[PDB]
Amino acid sequence: TTCCPSIVARSNFNVCRLPGTSEAICATYTGCIIIPGATCPGDYAN
């Protein structure tokens, strides 16, 4: 599950994924994170 720290970070993550870029690279590029569960924390609310 991916969790992003702001709306702009999520929008950038979604563009990063368009060509098929791995989630892990789009995470470090944008500041979003990947967690094994389904429940994003309050500081990664987007």
mmCIF file of all heavy atoms in Angstrom:
data_model
loop_
_atom_site.group_PDB
_atom_site.id
_atom_site.type_symbol
_atom_site.label_atom_id
_atom_site.label_comp_id
_atom_site.label_asym_id
_atom_site.label_seq_id
_atom_site.Cartn_x
_atom_site.Cartn_y
_atom_site.Cartn_z
ATOM 1 N N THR A 1 0.886 -1.198 0.000
ATOM 2 C CA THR A 1 0.000 0.000 0.000
ATOM 3 C C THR A 1 0.892 1.205 0.000
ATOM 4 O O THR A 1 1.910 1.218 0.692
ATOM 5 C CB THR A 1 -0.856 0.018 1.234
ATOM 6 O OG1 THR A 1 -1.655 -1.154 1.223
ATOM 7 C CG2 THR A 1 -1.758 1.231 1.294
ATOM 8 N N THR A 2 0.518 2.223 -0.765
ATOM 9 C CA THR A 2 1.302 3.437 -0.816
ATOM 10 C C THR A 2 0.569 4.547 -0.041
ATOM 11 O O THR A 2 -0.656 4.669 -0.099
ATOM 12 C CB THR A 2 1.570 3.883 -2.243
ATOM 13 O OG1 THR A 2 0.327 4.077 -2.889
ATOM 14 C CG2 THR A 2 2.386 2.852 -2.992
ATOM 15 N N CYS A 3 1.363 5.360 0.664
ATOM 16 C CA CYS A 3 0.864 6.461 1.469
ATOM 17 C C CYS A 3 1.709 7.698 1.127
ATOM 18 O O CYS A 3 2.927 7.608 1.085
ATOM 19 C CB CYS A 3 1.032 6.171 2.966
ATOM 20 S SG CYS A 3 0.395 4.569 3.502
ATOM 21 N N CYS A 4 1.082 8.849 0.906
ATOM 22 C CA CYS A 4 1.822 10.035 0.496
ATOM 23 C C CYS A 4 1.650 11.183 1.503
ATOM 24 O O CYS A 4 0.609 11.317 2.137
ATOM 25 C CB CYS A 4 1.366 10.479 -0.891
ATOM 26 S SG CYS A 4 1.820 9.313 -2.209
ATOM 27 N N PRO A 5 2.698 12.027 1.644
ATOM 28 C CA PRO A 5 2.691 13.053 2.698
ATOM 29 C C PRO A 5 1.878 14.302 2.368
ATOM 30 O O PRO A 5 1.606 15.088 3.269
ATOM 31 C CB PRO A 5 4.184 13.405 2.846
ATOM 32 C CG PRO A 5 4.740 13.156 1.480
ATOM 33 C CD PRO A 5 4.032 11.885 1.036
ATOM 34 N N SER A 6 1.525 14.495 1.104
ATOM 35 C CA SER A 6 0.707 15.632 0.691
ATOM 36 C C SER A 6 0.032 15.273 -0.636
ATOM 37 O O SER A 6 0.395 14.290 -1.299
ATOM 38 C CB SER A 6 1.534 16.899 0.531
ATOM 39 O OG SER A 6 2.349 16.788 -0.610
ATOM 40 N N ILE A 7 -0.945 16.090 -1.015
ATOM 41 C CA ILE A 7 -1.641 15.919 -2.277
ATOM 42 C C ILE A 7 -0.678 16.018 -3.461
ATOM 43 O O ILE A 7 -0.751 15.199 -4.374
ATOM 44 C CB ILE A 7 -2.790 16.942 -2.370
ATOM 45 C CG1 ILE A 7 -3.888 16.523 -1.386
ATOM 46 C CG2 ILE A 7 -3.289 17.079 -3.789
ATOM 47 C CD1 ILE A 7 -5.035 17.455 -1.322
ATOM 48 N N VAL A 8 0.208 17.007 -3.470
ATOM 49 C CA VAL A 8 1.122 17.158 -4.592
ATOM 50 C C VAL A 8 2.019 15.929 -4.702
ATOM 51 O O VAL A 8 2.305 15.476 -5.804
ATOM 52 C CB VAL A 8 1.959 18.470 -4.448
ATOM 53 C CG1 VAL A 8 3.242 18.423 -5.230
ATOM 54 C CG2 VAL A 8 1.144 19.684 -4.823
ATOM 55 N N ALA A 9 2.457 15.375 -3.576
ATOM 56 C CA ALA A 9 3.294 14.181 -3.625
ATOM 57 C C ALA A 9 2.545 13.008 -4.290
ATOM 58 O O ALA A 9 3.128 12.261 -5.069
ATOM 59 C CB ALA A 9 3.798 13.806 -2.250
ATOM 60 N N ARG A 10 1.270 12.826 -3.954
ATOM 61 C CA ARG A 10 0.464 11.787 -4.605
ATOM 62 C C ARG A 10 0.303 12.040 -6.100
ATOM 63 O O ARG A 10 0.409 11.110 -6.896
ATOM 64 C CB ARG A 10 -0.898 11.691 -3.938
ATOM 65 C CG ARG A 10 -1.857 10.704 -4.611
ATOM 66 C CD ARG A 10 -1.437 9.241 -4.494
ATOM 67 N NE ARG A 10 -1.528 8.779 -3.123
ATOM 68 C CZ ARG A 10 -1.231 7.549 -2.732
ATOM 69 N NH1 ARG A 10 -0.808 6.638 -3.600
ATOM 70 N NH2 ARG A 10 -1.339 7.243 -1.448
ATOM 71 N N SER A 11 0.015 13.274 -6.490
ATOM 72 C CA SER A 11 -0.134 13.551 -7.907
ATOM 73 C C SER A 11 1.166 13.247 -8.648
ATOM 74 O O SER A 11 1.138 12.697 -9.767
ATOM 75 C CB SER A 11 -0.546 15.000 -8.119
ATOM 76 O OG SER A 11 -1.824 15.219 -7.579
ATOM 77 N N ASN A 12 2.303 13.602 -8.052
ATOM 78 C CA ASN A 12 3.587 13.311 -8.666
ATOM 79 C C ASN A 12 3.853 11.795 -8.723
ATOM 80 O O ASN A 12 4.407 11.289 -9.698
ATOM 81 C CB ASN A 12 4.708 14.023 -7.905
ATOM 82 C CG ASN A 12 4.710 15.511 -8.116
ATOM 83 O OD1 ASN A 12 4.169 16.012 -9.104
ATOM 84 N ND2 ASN A 12 5.329 16.232 -7.196
ATOM 85 N N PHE A 13 3.456 11.071 -7.684
ATOM 86 C CA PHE A 13 3.601 9.620 -7.660
ATOM 87 C C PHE A 13 2.835 8.978 -8.824
ATOM 88 O O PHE A 13 3.339 8.082 -9.510
ATOM 89 C CB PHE A 13 3.113 9.075 -6.308
ATOM 90 C CG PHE A 13 3.336 7.600 -6.122
ATOM 91 C CD1 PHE A 13 4.504 7.143 -5.524
ATOM 92 C CD2 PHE A 13 2.390 6.675 -6.522
ATOM 93 C CE1 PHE A 13 4.732 5.791 -5.341
ATOM 94 C CE2 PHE A 13 2.620 5.309 -6.338
ATOM 95 C CZ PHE A 13 3.788 4.883 -5.744
ATOM 96 N N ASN A 14 1.608 9.439 -9.058
ATOM 97 C CA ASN A 14 0.791 8.864 -10.113
ATOM 98 C C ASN A 14 1.384 9.129 -11.497
ATOM 99 O O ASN A 14 1.286 8.272 -12.377
ATOM 100 C CB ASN A 14 -0.651 9.355 -10.024
ATOM 101 C CG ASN A 14 -1.386 8.731 -8.851
ATOM 102 O OD1 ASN A 14 -1.023 7.652 -8.379
ATOM 103 N ND2 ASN A 14 -2.433 9.391 -8.392
ATOM 104 N N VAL A 15 1.983 10.298 -11.702
ATOM 105 C CA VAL A 15 2.657 10.549 -12.968
ATOM 106 C C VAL A 15 3.903 9.652 -13.087
ATOM 107 O O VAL A 15 4.152 9.076 -14.147
ATOM 108 C CB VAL A 15 2.984 12.043 -13.140
ATOM 109 C CG1 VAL A 15 3.893 12.258 -14.339
ATOM 110 C CG2 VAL A 15 1.694 12.823 -13.293
ATOM 111 N N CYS A 16 4.680 9.522 -12.007
ATOM 112 C CA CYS A 16 5.857 8.655 -11.992
ATOM 113 C C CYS A 16 5.496 7.213 -12.394
ATOM 114 O O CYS A 16 6.272 6.535 -13.074
ATOM 115 C CB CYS A 16 6.484 8.726 -10.597
ATOM 116 S SG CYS A 16 7.963 7.706 -10.370
ATOM 117 N N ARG A 17 4.318 6.750 -11.993
ATOM 118 C CA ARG A 17 3.897 5.382 -12.300
ATOM 119 C C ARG A 17 3.396 5.180 -13.726
ATOM 120 O O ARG A 17 3.304 4.037 -14.173
ATOM 121 C CB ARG A 17 2.798 4.959 -11.316
ATOM 122 C CG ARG A 17 3.312 4.732 -9.894
ATOM 123 C CD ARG A 17 4.033 3.389 -9.757
ATOM 124 N NE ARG A 17 3.071 2.280 -9.760
ATOM 125 C CZ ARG A 17 3.336 1.023 -10.100
ATOM 126 N NH1 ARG A 17 4.517 0.664 -10.540
ATOM 127 N NH2 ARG A 17 2.397 0.098 -9.975
ATOM 128 N N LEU A 18 3.078 6.245 -14.459
ATOM 129 C CA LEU A 18 2.495 6.091 -15.804
ATOM 130 C C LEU A 18 3.333 5.207 -16.743
ATOM 131 O O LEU A 18 2.773 4.354 -17.434
ATOM 132 C CB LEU A 18 2.221 7.441 -16.477
ATOM 133 C CG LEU A 18 0.992 8.190 -15.979
ATOM 134 C CD1 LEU A 18 0.965 9.579 -16.604
ATOM 135 C CD2 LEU A 18 -0.303 7.437 -16.268
ATOM 136 N N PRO A 19 4.665 5.378 -16.803
ATOM 137 C CA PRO A 19 5.438 4.492 -17.678
ATOM 138 C C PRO A 19 5.703 3.105 -17.099
ATOM 139 O O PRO A 19 6.292 2.285 -17.791
ATOM 140 C CB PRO A 19 6.748 5.253 -17.897
ATOM 141 C CG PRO A 19 6.855 6.211 -16.790
ATOM 142 C CD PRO A 19 5.474 6.493 -16.285
ATOM 143 N N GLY A 20 5.293 2.852 -15.864
ATOM 144 C CA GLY A 20 5.501 1.556 -15.253
ATOM 145 C C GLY A 20 6.628 1.495 -14.224
ATOM 146 O O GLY A 20 6.956 0.411 -13.758
ATOM 147 N N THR A 21 7.188 2.650 -13.867
ATOM 148 C CA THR A 21 8.280 2.737 -12.907
ATOM 149 C C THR A 21 7.905 2.019 -11.613
ATOM 150 O O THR A 21 6.810 2.212 -11.107
ATOM 151 C CB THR A 21 8.523 4.215 -12.551
ATOM 152 O OG1 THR A 21 8.531 5.003 -13.752
ATOM 153 C CG2 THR A 21 9.812 4.406 -11.786
ATOM 154 N N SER A 22 8.823 1.240 -11.047
ATOM 155 C CA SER A 22 8.529 0.542 -9.802
ATOM 156 C C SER A 22 8.089 1.511 -8.711
ATOM 157 O O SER A 22 8.585 2.641 -8.605
ATOM 158 C CB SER A 22 9.742 -0.229 -9.312
ATOM 159 O OG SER A 22 10.756 0.684 -8.924
ATOM 160 N N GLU A 23 7.195 1.031 -7.855
ATOM 161 C CA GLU A 23 6.738 1.822 -6.733
ATOM 162 C C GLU A 23 7.896 2.298 -5.849
ATOM 163 O O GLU A 23 7.866 3.428 -5.357
ATOM 164 C CB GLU A 23 5.721 1.073 -5.875
ATOM 165 C CG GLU A 23 4.373 0.838 -6.555
ATOM 166 C CD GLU A 23 3.311 0.285 -5.621
ATOM 167 O OE1 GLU A 23 3.656 -0.368 -4.634
ATOM 168 O OE2 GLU A 23 2.113 0.467 -5.908
ATOM 169 N N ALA A 24 8.906 1.451 -5.635
ATOM 170 C CA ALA A 24 9.995 1.821 -4.732
ATOM 171 C C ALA A 24 10.782 3.038 -5.236
ATOM 172 O O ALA A 24 11.226 3.870 -4.437
ATOM 173 C CB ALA A 24 10.921 0.622 -4.507
ATOM 174 N N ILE A 25 10.993 3.137 -6.548
ATOM 175 C CA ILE A 25 11.671 4.302 -7.110
ATOM 176 C C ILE A 25 10.757 5.543 -7.078
ATOM 177 O O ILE A 25 11.206 6.651 -6.793
ATOM 178 C CB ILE A 25 12.172 4.017 -8.548
ATOM 179 C CG1 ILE A 25 13.426 3.151 -8.507
ATOM 180 C CG2 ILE A 25 12.518 5.291 -9.292
ATOM 181 C CD1 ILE A 25 14.665 3.892 -8.040
ATOM 182 N N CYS A 26 9.470 5.366 -7.371
ATOM 183 C CA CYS A 26 8.573 6.508 -7.292
ATOM 184 C C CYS A 26 8.436 7.007 -5.836
ATOM 185 O O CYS A 26 8.245 8.211 -5.619
ATOM 186 C CB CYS A 26 7.207 6.204 -7.882
ATOM 187 S SG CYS A 26 7.247 5.934 -9.671
ATOM 188 N N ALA A 27 8.580 6.115 -4.856
ATOM 189 C CA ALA A 27 8.540 6.493 -3.447
ATOM 190 C C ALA A 27 9.691 7.445 -3.100
ATOM 191 O O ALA A 27 9.455 8.528 -2.563
ATOM 192 C CB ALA A 27 8.581 5.254 -2.572
ATOM 193 N N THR A 28 10.932 7.062 -3.394
ATOM 194 C CA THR A 28 12.045 7.936 -3.042
ATOM 195 C C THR A 28 12.042 9.236 -3.865
ATOM 196 O O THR A 28 12.574 10.254 -3.434
ATOM 197 C CB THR A 28 13.411 7.238 -3.152
ATOM 198 O OG1 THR A 28 13.538 6.679 -4.460
ATOM 199 C CG2 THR A 28 13.570 6.189 -2.082
ATOM 200 N N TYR A 29 11.456 9.194 -5.056
ATOM 201 C CA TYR A 29 11.378 10.388 -5.881
ATOM 202 C C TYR A 29 10.413 11.436 -5.314
ATOM 203 O O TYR A 29 10.658 12.632 -5.420
ATOM 204 C CB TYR A 29 10.954 9.982 -7.280
ATOM 205 C CG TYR A 29 11.012 11.069 -8.305
ATOM 206 C CD1 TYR A 29 12.153 11.861 -8.464
ATOM 207 C CD2 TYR A 29 9.944 11.298 -9.143
ATOM 208 C CE1 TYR A 29 12.210 12.848 -9.410
ATOM 209 C CE2 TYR A 29 10.000 12.279 -10.103
ATOM 210 C CZ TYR A 29 11.140 13.045 -10.227
ATOM 211 O OH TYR A 29 11.217 14.034 -11.170
ATOM 212 N N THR A 30 9.313 10.964 -4.729
ATOM 213 C CA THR A 30 8.202 11.832 -4.350
ATOM 214 C C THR A 30 8.046 12.096 -2.858
ATOM 215 O O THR A 30 7.347 13.040 -2.477
ATOM 216 C CB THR A 30 6.863 11.243 -4.822
ATOM 217 O OG1 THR A 30 6.632 9.976 -4.186
ATOM 218 C CG2 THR A 30 6.836 11.122 -6.337
ATOM 219 N N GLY A 31 8.623 11.233 -2.026
ATOM 220 C CA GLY A 31 8.398 11.279 -0.606
ATOM 221 C C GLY A 31 7.266 10.390 -0.113
ATOM 222 O O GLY A 31 7.047 10.318 1.088
ATOM 223 N N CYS A 32 6.556 9.710 -1.011
ATOM 224 C CA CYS A 32 5.583 8.705 -0.606
ATOM 225 C C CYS A 32 6.325 7.480 -0.037
ATOM 226 O O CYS A 32 7.526 7.322 -0.231
ATOM 227 C CB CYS A 32 4.695 8.299 -1.797
ATOM 228 S SG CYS A 32 3.798 9.694 -2.553
ATOM 229 N N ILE A 33 5.583 6.636 0.666
ATOM 230 C CA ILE A 33 6.116 5.446 1.292
ATOM 231 C C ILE A 33 5.260 4.228 0.926
ATOM 232 O O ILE A 33 4.098 4.349 0.551
ATOM 233 C CB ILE A 33 6.221 5.611 2.831
ATOM 234 C CG1 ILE A 33 4.836 5.752 3.478
ATOM 235 C CG2 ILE A 33 7.134 6.796 3.161
ATOM 236 C CD1 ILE A 33 4.859 5.725 4.990
ATOM 237 N N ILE A 34 5.880 3.058 1.071
ATOM 238 C CA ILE A 34 5.235 1.774 0.858
ATOM 239 C C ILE A 34 5.202 1.043 2.193
ATOM 240 O O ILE A 34 6.236 0.898 2.853
ATOM 241 C CB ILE A 34 6.006 0.904 -0.154
ATOM 242 C CG1 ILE A 34 6.197 1.652 -1.470
ATOM 243 C CG2 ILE A 34 5.287 -0.424 -0.342
ATOM 244 C CD1 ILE A 34 7.126 0.945 -2.423
ATOM 245 N N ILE A 35 4.016 0.591 2.580
ATOM 246 C CA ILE A 35 3.844 -0.188 3.803
ATOM 247 C C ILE A 35 3.210 -1.527 3.472
ATOM 248 O O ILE A 35 2.511 -1.670 2.473
ATOM 249 C CB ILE A 35 2.984 0.585 4.849
ATOM 250 C CG1 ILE A 35 1.556 0.829 4.335
ATOM 251 C CG2 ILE A 35 3.664 1.884 5.196
ATOM 252 C CD1 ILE A 35 0.606 1.342 5.376
ATOM 253 N N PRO A 36 3.429 -2.535 4.328
ATOM 254 C CA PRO A 36 2.831 -3.846 4.049
ATOM 255 C C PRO A 36 1.350 -3.928 4.388
ATOM 256 O O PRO A 36 0.653 -4.782 3.839
ATOM 257 C CB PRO A 36 3.664 -4.815 4.899
ATOM 258 C CG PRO A 36 4.390 -3.977 5.886
ATOM 259 C CD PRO A 36 4.466 -2.593 5.371
ATOM 260 N N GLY A 37 0.882 -3.078 5.288
ATOM 261 C CA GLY A 37 -0.513 -3.074 5.667
ATOM 262 C C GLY A 37 -1.345 -2.182 4.767
ATOM 263 O O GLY A 37 -0.907 -1.812 3.686
ATOM 264 N N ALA A 38 -2.544 -1.847 5.228
ATOM 265 C CA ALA A 38 -3.516 -1.117 4.440
ATOM 266 C C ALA A 38 -3.890 0.226 5.070
ATOM 267 O O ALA A 38 -4.688 0.967 4.508
ATOM 268 C CB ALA A 38 -4.756 -1.975 4.221
ATOM 269 N N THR A 39 -3.313 0.535 6.229
ATOM 270 C CA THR A 39 -3.732 1.686 7.028
ATOM 271 C C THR A 39 -2.612 2.724 7.115
ATOM 272 O O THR A 39 -1.653 2.578 7.874
ATOM 273 C CB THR A 39 -4.159 1.240 8.436
ATOM 274 O OG1 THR A 39 -5.105 0.175 8.322
ATOM 275 C CG2 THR A 39 -4.801 2.379 9.195
ATOM 276 N N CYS A 40 -2.717 3.767 6.301
ATOM 277 C CA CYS A 40 -1.711 4.806 6.271
ATOM 278 C C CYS A 40 -1.785 5.677 7.518
ATOM 279 O O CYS A 40 -2.871 5.999 7.986
ATOM 280 C CB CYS A 40 -1.900 5.687 5.039
ATOM 281 S SG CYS A 40 -1.609 4.839 3.479
ATOM 282 N N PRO A 41 -0.620 6.088 8.035
ATOM 283 C CA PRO A 41 -0.602 6.945 9.220
ATOM 284 C C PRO A 41 -1.021 8.376 8.897
ATOM 285 O O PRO A 41 -1.044 8.809 7.749
ATOM 286 C CB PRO A 41 0.859 6.879 9.660
ATOM 287 C CG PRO A 41 1.602 6.681 8.412
ATOM 288 C CD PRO A 41 0.737 5.787 7.559
ATOM 289 N N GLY A 42 -1.344 9.117 9.952
ATOM 290 C CA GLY A 42 -1.895 10.451 9.812
ATOM 291 C C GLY A 42 -0.985 11.486 9.169
ATOM 292 O O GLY A 42 -1.493 12.479 8.646
ATOM 293 N N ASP A 43 0.333 11.280 9.218
ATOM 294 C CA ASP A 43 1.269 12.184 8.562
ATOM 295 C C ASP A 43 1.590 11.774 7.124
ATOM 296 O O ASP A 43 2.326 12.485 6.439
ATOM 297 C CB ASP A 43 2.543 12.440 9.394
ATOM 298 C CG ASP A 43 3.329 11.197 9.731
ATOM 299 O OD1 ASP A 43 2.781 10.079 9.717
ATOM 300 O OD2 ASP A 43 4.538 11.376 10.033
ATOM 301 N N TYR A 44 1.004 10.663 6.671
ATOM 302 C CA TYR A 44 1.052 10.230 5.271
ATOM 303 C C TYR A 44 -0.392 9.937 4.817
ATOM 304 O O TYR A 44 -0.746 8.820 4.433
ATOM 305 C CB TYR A 44 1.972 9.025 5.058
ATOM 306 C CG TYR A 44 3.434 9.356 5.225
ATOM 307 C CD1 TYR A 44 4.042 9.397 6.481
ATOM 308 C CD2 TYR A 44 4.208 9.634 4.117
ATOM 309 C CE1 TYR A 44 5.378 9.702 6.612
ATOM 310 C CE2 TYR A 44 5.543 9.936 4.236
ATOM 311 C CZ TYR A 44 6.120 9.979 5.484
ATOM 312 O OH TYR A 44 7.459 10.273 5.629
ATOM 313 N N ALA A 45 -1.207 10.986 4.887
ATOM 314 C CA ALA A 45 -2.658 10.896 4.803
ATOM 315 C C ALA A 45 -3.222 10.951 3.395
ATOM 316 O O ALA A 45 -4.435 10.776 3.216
ATOM 317 C CB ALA A 45 -3.245 12.034 5.609
ATOM 318 N N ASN A 46 -2.366 11.225 2.422
ATOM 319 C CA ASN A 46 -2.769 11.460 1.047
ATOM 320 C C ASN A 46 -2.259 10.383 0.084
ATOM 321 O O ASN A 46 -1.791 9.314 0.539
ATOM 322 C CB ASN A 46 -2.300 12.853 0.621
ATOM 323 C CG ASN A 46 -2.785 13.934 1.566
ATOM 324 O OD1 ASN A 46 -1.997 14.559 2.279
ATOM 325 N ND2 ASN A 46 -4.088 14.154 1.585
#
